[PDB]
Amino acid sequence: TLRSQLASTGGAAMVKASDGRTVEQWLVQSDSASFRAKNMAKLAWCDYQVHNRGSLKCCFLGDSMTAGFDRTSSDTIPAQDGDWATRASMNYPYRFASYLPEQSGCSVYITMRAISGYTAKQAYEEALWQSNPNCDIVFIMYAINDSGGVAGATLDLYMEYMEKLIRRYIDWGCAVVVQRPSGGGQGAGNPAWLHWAKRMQMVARVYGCPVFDAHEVMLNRHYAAVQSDGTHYNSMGYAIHGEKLASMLMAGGLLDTYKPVVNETTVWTGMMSDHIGWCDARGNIGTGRSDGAYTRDKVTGVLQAGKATICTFSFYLDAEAAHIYGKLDGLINTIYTNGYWWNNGNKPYYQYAVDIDNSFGASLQRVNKSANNYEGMPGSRKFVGRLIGRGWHTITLFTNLQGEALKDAFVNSITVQPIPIGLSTEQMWGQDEERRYRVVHTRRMPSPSGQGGTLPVAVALTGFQMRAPQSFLGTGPGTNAVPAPYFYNTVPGKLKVYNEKGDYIEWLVYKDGSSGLKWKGKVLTHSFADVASVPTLTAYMGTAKQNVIVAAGSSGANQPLENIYDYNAGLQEQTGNPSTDLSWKGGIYLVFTLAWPSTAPTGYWTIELEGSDWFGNSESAVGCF
Amino acid sequence: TLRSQLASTGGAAMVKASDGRTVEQWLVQSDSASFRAKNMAKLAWCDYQVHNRGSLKCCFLGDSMTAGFDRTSSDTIPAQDGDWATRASMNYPYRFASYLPEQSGCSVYITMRAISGYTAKQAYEEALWQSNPNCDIVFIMYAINDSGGVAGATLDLYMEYMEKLIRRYIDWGCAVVVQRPSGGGQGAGNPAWLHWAKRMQMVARVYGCPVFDAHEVMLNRHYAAVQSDGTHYNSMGYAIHGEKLASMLMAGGLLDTYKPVVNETTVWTGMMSDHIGWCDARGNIGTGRSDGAYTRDKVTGVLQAGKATICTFSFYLDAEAAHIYGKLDGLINTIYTNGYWWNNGNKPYYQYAVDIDNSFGASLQRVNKSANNYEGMPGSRKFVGRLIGRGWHTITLFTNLQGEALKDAFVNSITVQPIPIGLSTEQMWGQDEERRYRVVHTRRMPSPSGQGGTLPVAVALTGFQMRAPQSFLGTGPGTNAVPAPYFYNTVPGKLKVYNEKGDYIEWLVYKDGSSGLKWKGKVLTHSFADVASVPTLTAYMGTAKQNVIVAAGSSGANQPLENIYDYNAGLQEQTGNPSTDLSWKGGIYLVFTLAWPSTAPTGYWTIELEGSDWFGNSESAVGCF
Amino acid sequence: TLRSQLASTGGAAMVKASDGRTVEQWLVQSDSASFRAKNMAKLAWCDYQVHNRGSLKCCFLGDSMTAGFDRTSSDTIPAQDGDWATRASMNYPYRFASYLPEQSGCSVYITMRAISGYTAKQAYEEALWQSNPNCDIVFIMYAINDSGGVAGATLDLYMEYMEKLIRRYIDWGCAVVVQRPSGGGQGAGNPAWLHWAKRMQMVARVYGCPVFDAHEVMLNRHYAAVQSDGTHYNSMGYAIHGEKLASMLMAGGLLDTYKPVVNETTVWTGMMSDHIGWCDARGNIGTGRSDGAYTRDKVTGVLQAGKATICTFSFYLDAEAAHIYGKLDGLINTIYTNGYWWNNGNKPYYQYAVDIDNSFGASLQRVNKSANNYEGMPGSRKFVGRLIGRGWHTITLFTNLQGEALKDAFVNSITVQPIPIGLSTEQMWGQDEERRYRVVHTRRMPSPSGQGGTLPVAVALTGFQMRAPQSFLGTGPGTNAVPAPYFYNTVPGKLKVYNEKGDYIEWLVYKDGSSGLKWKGKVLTHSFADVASVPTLTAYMGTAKQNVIVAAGSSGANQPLENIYDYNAGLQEQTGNPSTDLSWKGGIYLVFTLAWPSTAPTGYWTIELEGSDWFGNSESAVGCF
């Protein structure tokens, strides 16, 4: 019966379309849409599981580099998981499965489909892997052995069989993630497998497979620190690669809508950003609205006391370096550099596998310095640290993992500012030298803006407030960041006063002793005939008081729903004591007082408070290391 | 007959493919390609209509937040459009339909498919919405009620039915735009609907649906200013969300090729950029080539006199803030901050719904200041303003909407420079304090560049021109920006002169009185034994004269087709009077004259004209507020 | 027989699906997946061929602008390649086919499918183009004649037939690349074809076609320099467009995973980046790991002596300008600006077709200056040049093309830093004026970082090293960049010394004569009562010595696999002679010595070495022009 024939396997081949081709050929050529749709559906599901403390069953492919090949170092463990070669003490799938749940709360289950020396053709034809593993996401890395001619693999065969593997795992219900092959000389020798896998990356993008640039992971690392032989990593290299893959997942890198961090990006807890993926690893971050938050979003990132809380911010850094700024408060253990989440210590050179500037002349060896106490100058913007290297970065903000935190830690905002790598510092004065920029905090009294057609009356410059430049802020854990007991913690600045008459005064604004936040100005350069005509400059470090712009209950009850606050109610001097000072959320101001000897001259004053700040720093950050 | 059976509904199920599955199952799994292709075809059509003064029929989905739910504030209007709950006086679909035609000229027709408390399953099964509305684009927002368990909605049911809605509206010929759900505490409480709709965003990207991050819209706003209750917006919040959606459309955000503004992006009228989408709302922008344009592209953005002209620049800002620089001239009414296109004034706290820095200590309450008169220092780069917050931004450059503009306004270029939020200012001296950077305008006479092997002869430093740093430029509407009548409008700078002999002179370059653009230098620090040996420093603010690089008609007639101009013909002093001065298109130069007392010493001079400029400012911008 | 009928052309139409539509209609609507998959598969293949010295058969479409229409200038050649109109002496397909193999080694074969005045409908119905050309990639540009109503072309007909052309060329095995139409007034007149082709771009993105923004190419150029008539280019405009298309290809712009350069991006040879595509044009770049590399990646980009080596870095610049920094060494001929790879010189105004800032007041006419000798201050970061304009940029690092290079040239890293256009310089002091930023190199002895709770002992400030700011570095070819023989090559800086006691000293740090790299400080401003109490400041320019962090062979042999090096072994003075000095890879340090007259006061010293640097410069770059 033709019916049975139509219902048979070859039924689609007996029906031809208007172009002369059979229906079966049309279906076979156009099935990439089904694979693409299934792939991104499963990828969206996997992203949801990553960001919602879910569970991921992960199948890990392909060859020796996925298998954790290590036959050179003494940090090896016997061959497991269907491999034949001695494995490093920690490969990338296992570091991924130990890292992703730790940072995001998403449980990871490993299905190791990795054999050393295997090709894409070998993986597609491997007897043990012919069954559906029923996992959620599959990471595929096959280029190194393919380009070496292993098992007669050619570029066409490699590409065909990697496409076949992608389609097979998509049909198996697995989200296919394609990895640019990792390992070996940071691109030394112009390896063919990079080109092969680039072609395969584009063919994978045909199916909507996200590409994890694993070659990018080791670009800014020390080769000796991450490699066991000329091609394969040691334990630390594999661990860093797995951590970077997990960072890609918690960044939202599985999604097509993901955008890398290219400019200054400020995110907080509970808000969804396509640039920085935030993961609450244990679900105990209190993302409630409180007026006590130091940001206008009022979204307190409460890392509550007594609860082991882990706050994770993952993103792709599209620059050679970035500066992490945060409105943090409390004892927050911060890890953001690879090689400090995991280091077994088996090899002494693992610690030198951190992301470092490749330019020998632009940076010394990177001694990573992270802050754990961000409780000083409470309410102020804190310098969390720096991220070196282009790629996927994770900022781990966690409290005591045993739940022994006595006070609430707050992550009110995390700012990732891509910075040029030579203009970045590990901490404030935490490296040999900081290439800073002379930043001018300028104020005009009276300002010419908005006047128009009319000359404002000249004013006497007797007192003014200026936001303290970054050099004026100290670095230290907790209250040690305040220069109150150690007035050397702040860099003396310059206050340059200009007027329309050509009268110029330059003061050296340095802190006056170790009792309170008081600054005293020394006259450096002035245009006056006598130095006795120069006013005495005294300043104090203070924060702006809180005024209520719109009080809740003004147009109904209910009906500016919340309180719109500003810190423009006046400047109050701070003594550096958090128990008696106001919150520094209103800003760190240097409130200058000019004690003129005679009557205060009236004029159109331009005040420039000079300091050195990091490149592009929006707000002066207090250092906490 | 098997034929009738094949032609029947179940005909595809009776034919099986080579894998054992029926042809019908193959078609059902692989139909995502058709939906994706139709979706982006309609999205491209919708983008064309947005950017070509077209017409869009917009169907608005889904729940209470799309419906404009407001049952708390007194700014409510009775339930319309098939909803049951009291609506805010302006929801986001209606603000979108009032904003998109106003800014782009694209007529918007509303089909309100929004009911308060509705889920994706309820929308797919809603009796009134089972018919094809025959609209062009559909915006879908369903996560809040789904995650609350409304009508038994689960995550799987939610995802299934949102995918069903997307496919249904794609088949109906509607461009499907997916919105990250908006509303409530800026991410407070770690809402489940954010995660659900993130998963749904990825599944929508399966179908090529652009994702409008509506959660991102309220991240940098005051919660009390935009919310009516804990989850739903008031009139201003909905208005800002609709304006942001329209900004996404006029940015080109409907297209996969759209790229966010990540670095300094300069665009003008009539040119197509994948970063900044420009919309001519009324078709009356004269985008002709004239040598009178202040830019080398010669594309004059003539907002012609007597014509109501609206120039719109929309884009996604991938930074926490940006600075708008423009080569504008004339009376251009500028609106670029949300909350100033629309504000009914019913609630006094609506004005505090502007994009503000969440850091209390990095910014006071944002008092938005926009310039309407950019006619001063004509030809110079103008500081248009700042954009705060990551997301979609619109820059509206419109003249008198009644056609009563007497002179032609010119938009020769608009530069959007992503800047760190703390380094941004609303206007020049328009906020409490500007965190500026000390910018050094350095010139070497003779320069060592390009010499090689040979020592150039030492030259006498008697006169030189330097581009005026930003601090040297004033702010004011029209001619009020020129410090000619009010010499306090400019900040005095420093001219530091170095030579190879170790001779150093530091002048205070301040403006000499209120008659003309003349600057006079006061000697601050010098290395000479006697201050009488220091030359007298006099400067004037002037522009470079026009020289013809290649005159049209030189190699044929026809045949450098146009005139290649440069402004390097010499420096001419300007008096600040636009009726007698040259155009400032040649740059704002401080032309210094050194009157040495004895013969002018010869040497290898390094001249550093110090000033304070905004972070990353390419060209010194004149302020116009 | 129904069987024959099913196997007939209309067989699919006789089988209907469950929705009532026939199987044929389902196949016709959902075939976009097959076209998309084939398109990106061929695009990945084409990208592989571009980056692996492959071969591309390129079919060039569409109208007069693809055909190289030029009927106005005297730089025309008779009509070739099936066109009817006089062609410019170099159109964009031929410049592309001469440029892509030159820069990437990928052989290009031209199939000219371009006729002047042709539309998309005309191209689809052209008799000569009905056959499959069996080429690899097709570039399509059809909007100008379509919007003019040529051959009755309407927007719907245009869109339909361009989609038909895209599908036809995808079925023909050709990678379809869609070009935003180029030509005419930089967007003058608000041309309709820009909008039409924007719609067509989105419909092309339906099929995964990469969009080459050719309208973006001429945005920052002089119109007179690139145009022959009001719409069509001259030879130079077409050449620049073809070079930009080739730059798009070597950037990896054919791939969906490509990301533009938005922030500082550092890449080297042999590494794969999704931001900067690196092409080894002749396969002779030695990308081996050597400790002699100036970067921590140790990937030497050896342009070996005696071999014609071409190193190409292509990328999309998502800013108005960028600065090219490189750790280069040797005689590397650098071309990075369009109009300098190709210029036939037939028209004198072709040289003014370079990417220039459109703001007349922010830049003079761009006199491009590129460095060929980067052998000075060996090991230091070099300022390669600047890239102006948003779009696709190529950095060509090639040695003597005849193989007469005597020494090995090294490309250890190329850094592309997007910079604001007004803050960019062509070379160090290579333009009229550099708008620099006052950068403060700050060091604290003792630093307050990491101490906590305890006051460190005060130290005497007798000697310290500081990384030299950019103003301290000279510019010149090879050893001419060293200020050793011509001490005017460096800009004198300021060393500001602060302490906790309010003692401030400001020195003028200028070079002490022309014998060696010795700097001497002149006291400018001090807070001391007597200038005799100020210490004598002497400095030398030196590099840090090499210390071994982890020596290879420490934990096994094999087993920190390589040597982890740092340059923190001490500071050694350099004389500027490359034959006797150390490599400058350890950094360019100004090592200051303070000779106090009495005993050296002890205190908490803040040292600020002030200089002027370019905006966002990570490491001080030596200029090489």
Author numbering:
A (entry chain A), B (entry chain A), C (entry chain A): 462 to 1086
Please share excerpts from the published article on this structure.
We isolated and characterized two Shigella podophages that have notably different features when compared with classical podophages and instead are most closely related to phage N4. We describe the isolation and characterization of phages Moo19 and B2, including whole-genome sequencing and analysis, cryo–electron microscopy (cryo-EM) structure determination, mass spectrometry, host range studies, and enzymatic assays of the tail proteins.
Because we could not resolve the highly flexible side tailspikes in either Moo19 or B2 virions, we purified these components to examine them separately. We used a similar approach as described by Subramanian et al. and purified gp82 alone. Using cryo-EM, we solved the structure of the isolated tailspikes to 2.4- and 2.3-Å resolution, respectively. Each structure is a homotrimer, with individual ribbons colored cyan, green, and magenta. Therefore, we tested the purified Moo19 tailspike gp82 and the complex tailspike from B2, gp49/49, for esterase activity using a colorimetric assay. A previous work on related phage G7C showed that the tailspike proteins act on the LPS molecule as an esterase.
